[model samples]
Target: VTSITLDLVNPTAGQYSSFVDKIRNNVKDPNLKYGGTDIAVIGPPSKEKFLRINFQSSRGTVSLGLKRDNLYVVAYLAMDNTNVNRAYYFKSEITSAELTALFPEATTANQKALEYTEDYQSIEKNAQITQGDKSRKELGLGIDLLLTFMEAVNKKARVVKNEARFLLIAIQMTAEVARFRYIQNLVTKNFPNKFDSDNKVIQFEVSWRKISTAIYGDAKNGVFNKDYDFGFGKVRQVKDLQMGLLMYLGKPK
Candidate 1:
């Protein structure tokens, strides 16, 4: 919606820990169990002056890297039982004419559109879950047989199932749907779109989230032509990118 300038400064260990705790506690979900979420430092925090923390939960997993220099808090939010992931990328705000050059069909009404490079029909599916289950069964059988020979030995120690890796391949169809929704929400939100002026990495993304349809929607397939093939033709959802800019400096402390 409006511009968001981040105040990046060096943070104390206490400040870093507090921010992580705030985000973890900020989300209020009734289904969130007491011991469901677990946060652990991956290593002795000092890689690139960043504290890397790994959070695992039944709902999803969130890996965060807090920079000591206060450059940025890099986060990777992912679903546990699916391959759904919400990743970050930098892109400059483009004008209507620029967008038209990129996608010839892009119009003021069309707004932000995505031209898919790959076709949906061409993508082949795999039987990864079935193969994983087969391996797990073999491991379980081996563990059980080992216990019979040496009962005192640790049979379960060597036998372990990678839940995160296993779950990613278990449900592909569900993951695809979840992934689509995740991207839709990310680009639709009025999050930070400031300029990286210091390094000139990117300009101010003023036109962020001002799209008619969702950002990642397939223009060819997802859209309905003016011929009115279906029922609704060329639908556009209104957003407040301009109004938000006006209120940017108007908002009080």
Candidate 2:
């Protein structure tokens, strides 16, 4: 089961200012290619199984970090950090193997981190959504899922900058996560015997059109700004958020 939670993957003290600049540049132009997103350890430099996985391209960038090892994560496209770019943090347990793979070559070292935005006590980890349910029923952010993103949007009403930024990062995470799952799900379906025989399989990319369509109509996911009513507050059109409109980077041999 996938339960989306919250956590933060901050840029190191030295990396913070520079990372913000990168964000600004990208904001000016989404297709500013030139970047694996090296994993960096953050949050008071804790010794838990904490680690971050980042992958970058001209199309978009994605960061997947383990904060208690939750299933769903956020940071790029659909997410927080506040330069402020908003990111999502999921609560999940980290597997030893996942840690072993991530921690071995991960970057470390910190000395006093700074906050550029106000304290975000809103998301406070109450957010959640479930996967793997089948009833031909659409997923929800209320019942069952109960993730009131509108709260974030209307939080102070102009989360305008913060909420929108956070939402952008969320999109990045979603693209990465979705494609991986789609690729794997197809493999397991067509090659169930081979897939379970030795546990060795890998895939990349997706049918963005179908997957985006699979997510549901305009009231959520990518069209929140235009679809949802925000009283008198101004919400930036998702297009102006400065990330590629397409949700993919492509694949080949």
Candidate 3:
């Protein structure tokens, strides 16, 4: 239970008390429960309607009040009966001033990159969905999230289950994989070490459907490397991280 420190915040059962009512009243998944029952799980919505309060604080900002535009990491975990989460609010995006409040490390020089990477992972994962083309209300993605997550991991915030940590990691890592892939096509194109050409990068080209397969193995069973074993080696971390995503999205497999 000792790990990274991304300074992510978590929502209380209290916050969800109302939010659950919204999800229930809206999509009304009878299976969906907040403080009282297993918190409901949702696939990433296609051509989505995710919104969140982009609140600010001098210390930094975090998403709290829920409406459904962006998505949830803390709320998602709180509802997850399986993993142990350390009170963390996940990432979302917004106005220029608002974005930096939520993502402290985000810089103007890299702002454009951040925006592109945000949409990068989703376009890959949910190819069927569109944020809408051209003339529109605007959209979002998962890069700023990756920065916060890795920082959380870097700072050591109790990532007990890599399995649980995997889903969140994939959003960021996969976005990163996408970002890296883009750079490989750039001025550095002549560079010998293309990101797409790397085996390490290959390990991360994941989709949410592949999570279970990585965990259970196709047609075999959920009977592999039996425990979070460092002695078992970290190579499988990427394998499991890939697997981490598919199950939560609840699709394909």
lDDT of 2 at 153: 38
Query: Cα RMSD to native, each candidate?
Result: 21.8, 19.9, 17.5
lDDT of 3 by residue, 154-216 (tens): 324334332233333433332232223322232134321212223233334333234334443
TM for every model, in the order presented, reads 0.18, 0.21, 0.25
When 2 and 3 are scored with TM-score, the better candidate is 3
Candidate that would win on lDDT: 3
lDDT of 1 by residue, 39-64 (tens): 11112223233333333333233332
Provide the lDDT at 211 for model 2: 26
List candidate 3 stretches off by more than 4 Å.
Answer: 1-202, 205-207, 212-217, 223-253
How many pairs of residues collide in each model? 0, 28, 24
Deviation from native of the Cα of residue 129 in model 1, angstroms = 39
Q: Write the per-residue lDDT of candidate 2 for residues 47-152, one digit (tens) a residue.
A: 4334344433222233444332221232222222222222332223343344334433322221111122211222221122133321111121111111233224
Q: For candidate 3, what is the TM-score?
A: 0.25
In candidate 1, where is summed lDDT lowest over 10 consecutive residues?
195-204
Q: By descending TM-score, how would the candidates be arranged?
A: 3, 2, 1
